């Protein structure tokens, strides 16, 4: 299924994922696709920072759902 990952800085990323995918897997997809390393990713959905070990299914994330991507990298 298809979900959307909207950053705070303009870009919305369109991913192909499955409900049994873990947040960990999704972050790895985002790395594959966008080159953003998992460590620099904070993912938010419906008011909750998503935990790596749980699944999209666990969070009730469905087709056309929109997640939010906060990037974590500081300097200095």
């Amino acid at each position: 299924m298809q979900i959307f990952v909207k950053t705070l800085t303009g870009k919305t990323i369109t991913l192909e994922v499955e409900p049994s995918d873990t947040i960990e897997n999704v972050k790895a997809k985002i790395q594959d696709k966008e080159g953003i390393p998992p460590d620099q990713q904070r993912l938010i959905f419906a008011g909750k920072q998503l935990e790596d070990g749980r699944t999209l299914s666990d969070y009730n994330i469905q087709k056309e759902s929109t997640l939010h991507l906060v990037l974590r990298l500081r300097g200095x």
Binding site: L8, G47, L71, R74
Partner: protein
């Protein structure tokens, strides 16, 4: 040396500000501008968290977390650098971005990059046909020869380094005008 190049040397930890100022070639950015950019980014994140209810456990736990955009040592984030660049019509992306990489651009033909090494921001940019390192931790601007540039940016692969390419027409400055032909 290299006096016609604008080079803001490192005051303590204000490296984001020197990085941006050195890229744009002047005193473009001040501490208040960047703190406000971070505060608004913080508020944007809070709004996304409030989607769950400002009374929920998750929301309240979040308010007890440090900012991801301006920490208590005064470090600014990639999101703040991003938004400061938008002021000037500039976009920024991980140099290792797979869509960008497919373009097949020779890095020698870009105009500016921003690097993050061990939590320090520095700029590398081109004036005329010449690449310079504009790192605030440096006595002064230093040439980087074309044969070296790509290899320099490839430090990405190290855990220590993150390398960004800044796309768009940079504002005009005396250094470009002097070094062009």
């Amino acid at each position: 040396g290299m006096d016609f190049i604008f080079h803001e040397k490192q005051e303590g930890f204000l490296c984001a500000q020197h990085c941006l100022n050195n890229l744009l070639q002047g005193e473009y950015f001040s501490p208040v501008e960047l703190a406000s950019i971070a505060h608004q980014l913080d508020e944007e994140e809070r709004m996304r968290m409030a989607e769950g209810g400002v009374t929920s456990e998750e929301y309240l736990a979040f308010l007890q977390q440090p900012s991801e955009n301006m920490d208590d040592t005064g470090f600014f984030s990639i999101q703040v650098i991003s938004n400061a660049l938008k002021f000037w019509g500039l976009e920024i992306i991980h140099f290792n971005n797979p869509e960008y990489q497919k373009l097949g651009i020779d890095p020698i033909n870009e105009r500016s990059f921003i690097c993050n090494y061990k939590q320090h921001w520095f700029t590398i940019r081109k004036f005329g046909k010449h690449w310079f390192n504009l790192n605030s931790l440096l006595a002064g601007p230093e040439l980087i020869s074309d044969t070296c540039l790509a290899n320099f940016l490839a430090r990405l692969q190290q855990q220590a380094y993150s390398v960004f390419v800044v796309k768009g027409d940079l504002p005009d400055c005396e250094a470009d005008q002097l070094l062009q032909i």
